[PDB]
Amino acid sequence: FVQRSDFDALGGRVTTVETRVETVNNSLTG
Amino acid sequence: FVQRSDFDALGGRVTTVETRVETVNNSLTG
Numbered sequence: 001f002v003q004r005s006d007f008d009a010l011g012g013r014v015t016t017v018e019t020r021v022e023t024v025n026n027s028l029t030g
Numbered sequence: 031f032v033q034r035s036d037f038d039a040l041g042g043r044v045t046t047v048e049t050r051v052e053t054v055n056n057s058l059t060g
């Protein structure tokens with residue numbers, strides 16, 4: 001199985017990418 | 031619960047997307 005810390009660590013990366021995928025789209029649209 | 035294989039399988043997708051989100055931004059910025 002997998003520990004809670006590893007799952008929470010991966011959750012931060014997913015949230016961070018969700019911000020960048022929209023910042024990049026907004027930056028280039030400008 | 032969830033097995034280690036499924037967590038590691040999802041880890042590859044997150045890493046792959048992290049590369050594409052920057053390649054796409056760099057390709058369009060060029």
